[PDB]
Every structure is written in C-alpha cells, then in structure tokens.
Amino acid sequence: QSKKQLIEPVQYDEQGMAFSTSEGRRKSATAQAVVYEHGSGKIHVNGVD
RNA sequence: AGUAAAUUAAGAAUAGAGAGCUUAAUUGAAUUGAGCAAUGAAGUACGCACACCCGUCACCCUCCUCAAAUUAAAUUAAACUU
Ligand SMILES: [Mg+2]
C-alpha cells in the first residue's frame, strides 16, 4: 500500500497559463478548486471574493 | 466525537388536531484515573452447607421404673414317738 499522494496533471488554459484542478469533500459540502501556478493570491469562491 | 449541546427542516398518521414520534441537515465542544474499588466475565484460592442444627421450657396421651409401709394373694421341708 503506497501511502504517497497521487499528483494531479498540469493542464494549460487558452491564455496558456498552467493550472491544476482537484475535488474536495467535507461533510456534505463538495468543492472543485482550480489553482493557477502564477498569481497574486486572489482566491474567488463561487465567482465572489 | 461529527458525539453531547444548540439550531433547523421534512415525514408518518387526520377533514382538522402533539410541546409526541421518525428521519435529514447545520454549528460544534469539555473530559477520559496516584481510588475511595460496584457489578458482569476469566483465573485463583478459600466459606458454606443442603439437594432447595441443637438446648430449654408450652398443653396433649402413654408405657416404664423405683417407691413408704400396709393389705394380702398365695406357699413349703417335713420331722418326730411307741
Ligand atoms: Mg399536526
């Protein structure tokens, strides 16, 4: 049993910036984050700050 | 331990009727042993006495024995003289 995280791929946007996506589940909530390799720390949740 | 707590929603059943019941969700803890030891099991030893006691005195009836003398009921060797 490999207790080692399964690294996600690194996709590319139309602009060409690198980004990865992953799902998360806590209680009944489910989230789908889309981290970008380069940014200024701007997190937008459901299109809101 | 997503527990307690708190806050919500729905459902069953009714024509209507619960502060009840069932189910779902949200927020979300504190604590978990230097005893003073309660049960249930395991092991361990011992305690108990039955198969779930004696003593005295209480009324009851019976045989038994001795027992004071009394009253008797009755018994028994027979010898001896000419
Ligand atoms: Mg009602």
UniProtKB/Swiss-Prot annotation:
It comes from Mus musculus. This is Small ribosomal subunit protein uS9m. Component of the mitochondrial ribosome small subunit (28S) which comprises a 12S rRNA and about 30 distinct proteins. Belongs to the universal ribosomal protein uS9 family. The chain holds residues 245 to 293 of 390 of the full protein. It is found in: Mitochondrion.
